[PDB]
Enzyme design. Sequence first.
Site, short mmCIF file in Angstrom:
data_model
loop_
_atom_site.label_atom_id
_atom_site.label_comp_id
_atom_site.label_asym_id
_atom_site.label_seq_id
_atom_site.Cartn_x
_atom_site.Cartn_y
_atom_site.Cartn_z
N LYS A 33 29.70 86.81 37.78
CA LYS A 33 29.82 86.23 39.12
C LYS A 33 31.07 86.85 39.73
CE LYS A 33 29.95 81.79 38.95
NZ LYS A 33 29.75 80.31 38.72
N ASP A 66 33.46 84.09 35.72
CA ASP A 66 33.56 83.57 37.09
C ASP A 66 34.92 83.94 37.65
OD1 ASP A 66 33.19 80.19 38.53
OD2 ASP A 66 33.52 82.14 39.48
N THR A 67 35.97 83.13 37.45
CA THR A 67 37.29 83.54 37.91
C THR A 67 37.87 84.67 37.07
OG1 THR A 67 38.61 81.97 36.55
CG2 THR A 67 37.83 81.19 38.76
N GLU A 118 29.62 87.04 25.75
CA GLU A 118 30.06 85.88 26.53
C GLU A 118 28.97 85.54 27.56
OE1 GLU A 118 33.10 82.93 27.92
OE2 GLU A 118 31.28 83.18 26.77
N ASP A 119 28.89 84.25 27.93
CA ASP A 119 27.81 83.79 28.80
C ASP A 119 28.02 84.24 30.24
OD1 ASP A 119 28.82 80.22 28.91
OD2 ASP A 119 30.02 82.04 29.24
N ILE A 120 29.16 83.91 30.83
CA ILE A 120 29.35 84.21 32.26
C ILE A 120 30.85 84.37 32.53
CG2 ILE A 120 29.39 81.72 32.89
CD1 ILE A 120 27.84 82.40 35.47
N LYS A 146 30.15 77.32 23.10
CA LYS A 146 28.73 77.17 22.73
C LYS A 146 27.83 78.03 23.58
CE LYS A 146 28.07 72.68 22.87
NZ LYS A 146 27.61 71.28 22.51
N1 LIG Z 1 27.12 76.37 33.33
C1 LIG Z 1 27.93 77.20 34.04
N2 LIG Z 1 29.16 77.52 33.56
C2 LIG Z 1 29.98 78.36 34.25
C3 LIG Z 1 29.56 78.92 35.42
N3 LIG Z 1 30.58 79.70 35.86
C4 LIG Z 1 31.59 79.62 34.96
N4 LIG Z 1 31.19 78.81 33.98
C5 LIG Z 1 31.97 78.34 32.84
O1 LIG Z 1 33.30 78.80 32.97
C6 LIG Z 1 33.55 79.85 31.99
C7 LIG Z 1 34.19 81.05 32.63
O2 LIG Z 1 35.20 80.66 33.50
P1 LIG Z 1 36.15 81.70 34.22
O3 LIG Z 1 37.41 81.59 33.38
O4 LIG Z 1 35.57 83.08 34.29
O5 LIG Z 1 36.27 81.05 35.59
C8 LIG Z 1 32.18 80.17 31.42
O6 LIG Z 1 32.28 80.70 30.12
C9 LIG Z 1 31.43 78.86 31.53
O7 LIG Z 1 31.83 77.94 30.54
C10 LIG Z 1 28.28 78.59 35.90
O8 LIG Z 1 27.85 79.08 36.98
N5 LIG Z 1 27.52 77.75 35.19
MG LIG Z 2 30.48 80.79 26.01
MG LIG Z 3 29.55 75.98 27.12
#
Ligand SMILES: Nc1nc2c(ncn2[C@@H]2O[C@H](COP(=O)(O)O)[C@@H](O)[C@H]2O)c(=O)[nH]1
Ligand SMILES: [Mg+2]
Ligand SMILES: [Mg+2]
Lengths: 218, 217
Positions: free
Chosen positions: A164, A135-136, A131-133, A82
């Site tokens: 990030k 992180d890992t 995509e929103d963000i 979402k």
């Molecule tokens: N609300 C929020 N979601 C995050 C944040 N960092 C990672 N996420 C969530 O984790 C997903 C990405 O995770 P990754 O696989 O890159 O660690 C994002 O699409 C989001 O759902 C954050 O700072 N805030």
């Molecule tokens: Mg998303």
């Molecule tokens: Mg979400």
Amino acid sequence: PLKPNFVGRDADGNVTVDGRSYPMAESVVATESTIHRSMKEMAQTLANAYKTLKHRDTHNKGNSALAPITDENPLIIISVLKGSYIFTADMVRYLGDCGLPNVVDFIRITSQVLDNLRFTELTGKHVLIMEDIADTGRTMKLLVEKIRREYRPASLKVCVLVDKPGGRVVDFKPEFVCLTAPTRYVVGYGFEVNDRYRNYRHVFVLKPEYAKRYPSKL
Amino acid sequence: PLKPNFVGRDADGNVTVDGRSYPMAESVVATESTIHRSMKEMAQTLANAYKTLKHRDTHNKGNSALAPITDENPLIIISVLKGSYIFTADMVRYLGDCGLPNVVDFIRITQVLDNLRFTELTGKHVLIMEDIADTGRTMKLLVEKIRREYRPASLKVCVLVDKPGGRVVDFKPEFVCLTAPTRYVVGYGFEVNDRYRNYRHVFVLKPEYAKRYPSKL
Ligand SMILES: Nc1nc2c(ncn2[C@@H]2O[C@H](COP(=O)(O)O)[C@@H](O)[C@H]2O)c(=O)[nH]1
Ligand SMILES: [Mg+2]
Ligand SMILES: [Mg+2]
Ligand SMILES: Nc1nc2c(ncn2[C@@H]2O[C@H](COP(=O)(O)O)[C@@H](O)[C@H]2O)c(=O)[nH]1
Ligand SMILES: [Mg+2]
Ligand SMILES: [Mg+2]
């Protein structure tokens, strides 16, 4: 959205933006005007990156030559639900401002695939994930692998609202990054805690004491 | 979005908005500034309608009393994919400006293709955000289904566009941003095989463009 925003603190010591208090916010990552400035510039970056490319003609299946990116064969955008829907809504309008024809389909995943794409003709297409963000990096790394294997697009790139990079645990670099955040949990403008705060116009660092604030299932 | 948009015609007779030509458009229904004015007015209307209502407390399930609409127990918004996603994105931010706590989940229909993931709607105030009502069959069926399967405390529909001249079943949206004649519109969420969805204005489509993109995406 591009009116300059004023960050301050109220008498209770809560962060304010333009006079409105945000008791959940530790600090401000980016105000609305900052966010939209980066999105308008990013739409031009995207237009420039894609507007002269060519890919498989599915508008006219009798054709064999590669076709330019047009309303006939637009850029395919995969928007991750979402978290990406607001970002995508604003970005595709700025892409229209820049004259880049595109169409949007959604996929819903965890972070695995809850709701599949309904577009079926992605092979040999230019495809952009919105995509929103990151992180890992693990979620997009896996999604990119899944789309590449299942569809074999001509190109497959990722545009994130927020990178990030300090959180990386796998090698994943989005080609297009609007904003960069510190290695903290952010909320606002698409980002949420159990769906709260998603409709705010600014991106904030969440206070740690708010991380578990809404544990009841919706 | 809200500075007045200039509507004209270019040397080829095509519709222009702010100097940009739209060859697929018969005419302009509403420009961006008009649409956003109607959405801001609708957000205040929605906030007034909901801000003082009370519904089931699922934040603190040990509380038997009904609870106000808050971040703890927000308004539940069901947004209909794909057509409503841009309308919904804009509307929820206007709702935030008006101080109405809300959360959004999506349902995809064409038949139900992808169901909601929210499950705790019983005794909640629920608002459906939808792009356009024409014959009204789509929303009449969605409303019946949500009522039956989720048993909300209240269920209402907000549409960006109503075409009341096309209504042919017992369905009347409670909340309407814009009212249009019985013509096929595109732009600002409305599309022809997904084209024109990202434009900022709503147009009557030229009938000649209705079948321009027959090929499956
Ligand atoms: N609300 C929020 N979601 C995050 C944040 N960092 C990672 N996420 C969530 O984790 C997903 C990405 O995770 P990754 O696989 O890159 O660690 C994002 O699409 C989001 O759902 C954050 O700072 N805030
Ligand atoms: Mg998303
Ligand atoms: Mg979400
Ligand atoms: N793009 C576009 N879609 C329409 C229009 N009128 C009805 N629709 C489509 O038909 C659905 C509802 O149709 P109904 O069941 O009310 O006749 C809408 O959600 C939308 O998909 C229109 O003027 N333009
Ligand atoms: Mg659809
Ligand atoms: Mg819809």
